[PDB]
Design a protein around this ligand. Structure first.
Ligand SMILES: NCCCNCCCN
Length: 322
């Protein structure tokens, strides 16, 4: 007990060296595995029931998982770096008092573009991706809520709607986008842009930065309205066997030197205030990472949709198959 840790997380987030460092420091073996979406993570936790000590839901999955008895309370007294978290990302209605989730990574989705291949001024909004000239060229995120977010935004509906008529209208709108779609990728989304398989599509800010670090000219065009904002938080599954190890890993990732060093490698913003303050000006004011104020004001954080989540999934699965 607590000699190992079963950690299930998003791809891109933890460099291999970081896990080696954790094991070096604690003597705790990490059995690490990754996922590309909340929907894949969730389906896995439902099938297995137990088997994981840590999982990383986006904030729009936290309330659902708590209500379904899938999570357990996190002890803040075991997290010496809880004080380092930015208060602006804490104590939200999805998890009052952060009893079930700890802010870990926040990011945004815009339009990824290869500037050596295509023109920046030719795209300003999500709806521009529907243009006929993009036939068989786009990458979309492999994420039901993000893909529906862009169509709902295009239609002038809330990207967090629970209205089945609006969800169906977004599905019909997305069917018109499908001739422009080459791939759906949320696993290693920087890789199609790096390989030149795609020059345009949806892209996370972190993924675009990683592509730039490898020498590719991958920028982010921030849609004028409807830019997606999201946050991933760490949670402890209800059946966790290694609770002490789980808190040790959360605290290790909250450690400002770790959160800052990792942010510089993966290209994502951090909700750890102390770590954010350690970031160089070049990273902190990178326009493809941190959206301008107008983009923030006209964008939307991904929020829970309650039982309508099944409807988003059903239609997104239909889009991917047909
Ligand atoms: N590797 C980046 C993970 C982003 N997870 C949150 C996605 C929310 N739609």
């Amino acid at each position: 007990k607590d000699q190992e840790l079963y950690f299930y997380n998003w791809s891109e987030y933890i460099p291999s060296e970081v896990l080696e460092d954790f094991t070096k420091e604690t003597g705790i073996k990490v059995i690490y595995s990754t996922y590309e979406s909340n929907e894949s993570m969730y389906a896995k936790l439902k099938t297995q029931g137990a088997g994981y000590d840590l999982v990383v839901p986006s904030t729009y999955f936290v309330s659902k998982m708590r209500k379904e008895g899938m999570l357990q309370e996190i002890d803040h007294s075991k997290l010496s770096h809880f004080k380092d978290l930015d208060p602006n990302y804490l104590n939200k209605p999805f998890d009052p008092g952060n009893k079930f989730s700890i802010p870990y990574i926040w990011g945004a989705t815009g339009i990824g573009i290869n500037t050596d291949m295509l023109d920046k001024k030719s795209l300003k909004n999500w709806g521009d991706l529907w243009d006929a000239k993009w036939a068989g060229q786009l990458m979309l995120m492999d994420d039901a809520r993000e893909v529906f977010h862009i169509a709902l935004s295009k239609l002038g509906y809330s990207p967090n709607t629970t209205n089945p008529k609006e969800i169906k209208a977004a599905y019909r709108e997305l069917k018109k986008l499908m001739p422009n779609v080459l791939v759906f990728n949320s696993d290693f989304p920087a890789n199609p842009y790096l390989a030149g398989e795609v020059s345009l599509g949806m892209l996370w800010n972190g993924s675009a930065y990683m592509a730039r670090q490898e020498g590719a000219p991958i920028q982010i065009i921030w849609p004028e309205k409807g830019t997606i904002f999201w946050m991933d938080s760490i949670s402890i599954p209800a059946g966790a066997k290694n609770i002490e190890a789980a808190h040790k890993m959360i605290d290790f990732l909250l450690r400002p030197e770790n959160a800052a060093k990792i942010a510089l490698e993966i290209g994502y913003p951090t909700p750890v205030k102390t770590a954010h303050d350690l970031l160089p000006k070049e990273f902190a004011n990178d326009p493809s990472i941190y959206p301008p104020q107008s983009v923030i004001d006209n964008g939307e954080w991904q929020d829970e949709v309650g039982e309508a989540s099944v409807l988003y999934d059903e239609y997104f699965q239909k889009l991917k198959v047909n």
